[PDB]
Design a protein around this ligand. Structure first.
Ligand SMILES: [Zn+2]
Lengths: 58, 49, 98, 139, 49
């Protein structure tokens, strides 16, 4: 899978539907900022500092 | 029952948004309900030659 | 300043000319190799589907480059995409293969 | 959808020819080291609150002099600097510099808001000043 | 060069714009917070270093 707006790689169709909401597309909330570079494969998300058990998120 | 507080109902020739707020507060008004979306800060960092 | 703009509601995506115009993914283009290297991944996903079956053509200008040869029998079907895709997806902001 | 609180208050799709995840490039600046440095530098500032009152009206902090308070904060900063640099003696000292700074004051909990010392806290002063003039029943 | 694409929407709410006066007042409050306490200056300079 992949989003043709920001060129990010997803895995599930529900994942794509939840991802396009950050750009403004609908379908049929934990992140604060979401970046992605164009020369490498390494997204960087940023989540609030009080939440528990963060899985590799700044 | 105080009809002064139920103004838009009792008073026929009153605009639906009229309020005499400083003197008597009304108990039946016109509320405006919203439904927004607050997306996260998105960016696509491109490189420069 | 090469910027991409996603297409919406069926309209094709567009890339920005050096002179401020935005064009679709088709025709004859001219890239600096550094311009490709700085965006090796964002460009593969957007462009490779159009070079393979579409009508896109790009002239990556390099000046000098080492090469490698692959010989094939002319009387049998042959196809270059498996070779020319493993090169494009391996171009990097620091290296290029033969 | 109920959001908790941080404190307490009053209580035929074939694979298209572009995608891959092979990780050919590695950054020279070092993404992990840059993220670590950014994490260290992103932190908000310490809250310097001593000298300000609490709910009951009593100032917060120790009962030490102002200037000695400034000196203690200075050499504690020096010790922390040495600890961060991972040495025995800090190389960038905040204390015992060449500058004569004997007039420097640093906010402490010795002085209240009026301008008097609190050797007897504000609540105690109020309580005794009010109790000095109460009266009882005759008999 | 950063780029952040999106679709046409009017019900999007991203409250982040302020005036320079509020930034200046916050700066004054922080300068007062410093208060000759070297402990609140040390980590800033060390981490920027
Ligand atoms: Zn996306």
């Amino acid at each position: 899978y992949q989003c043709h707006v920001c060129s990010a790689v997803l895995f599930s169709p529900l994942d794509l539907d939840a991802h396009v909401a950050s750009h403004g597309l609908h379908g049929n909330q934990r992140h604060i900022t979401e970046f992605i570079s164009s020369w490498q494969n390494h997204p960087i998300v940023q989540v609030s500092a009080d939440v528990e058990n963060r899985k590799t998120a700044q | 029952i105080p009809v002064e507080r139920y103004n838009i109902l009792t008073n026929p020739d009153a605009p639906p948004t009229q309020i005499q707020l400083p003197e008597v507060v009304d108990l039946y008004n016109v509320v405006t309900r919203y439904a927004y979306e607050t997306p996260p800060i998105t960016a696509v960092v491109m490189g420069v030659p | 300043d090469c910027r991409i703009s996603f297409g919406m509601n069926g309209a094709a995506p567009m890339i920005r000319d050096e002179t401020g115009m935005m064009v679709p993914f088709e025709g004859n283009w001219i890239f600096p190799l550094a311009l490709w290297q700085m965006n090796t991944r964002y460009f593969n996903q957007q462009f490779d589907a159009w070079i393979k079956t579409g009508e896109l053509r790009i002239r990556i200008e390099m000046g000098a480059y080492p090469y490698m040869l692959h010989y094939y029998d002319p009387r049998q079907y042959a196809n270059a995409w498996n070779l020319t895709s493993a090169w494009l997806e391996e171009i990097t902001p620091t290296s290029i293969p033969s | 959808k109920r959001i908790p609180r941080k404190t307490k208050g009053k209580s035929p799709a074939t694979a298209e020819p572009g995608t891959s995840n092979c990780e050919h490039y590695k950054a020279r600046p070092g993404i992990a080291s840059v993220q670590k440095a950014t994490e260290s530098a992103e932190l908000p500032m310490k809250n310097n609150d001593e000298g300000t009152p609490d709910k009951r009206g009593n100032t917060k902090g120790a009962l030490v002099n102002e200037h000695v308070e400034a000196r203690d904060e200075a050499d504690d900063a020096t010790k922390k600097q040495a600890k961060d640099t991972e040495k025995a003696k800090a190389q960038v000292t905040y204390s015992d510099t060449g500058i004569n700074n004997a007039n420097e004051l640093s906010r402490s909990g010795n002085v209240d808001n009026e301008g008097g010392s609190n050797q007897k806290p504000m609540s105690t002063r109020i309580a005794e000043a009010t109790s000095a003039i109460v009266s009882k029943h005759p008999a | 060069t950063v780029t952040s694409p999106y679709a046409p929407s009017v019900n999007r709410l991203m409250p982040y714009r302020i005036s320079n006066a509020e930034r200046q007042i916050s700066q004054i409050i922080r300068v007062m917070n410093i208060g000759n306490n070297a402990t609140v200056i040390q980590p800033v300079l060390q981490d920027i270093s």
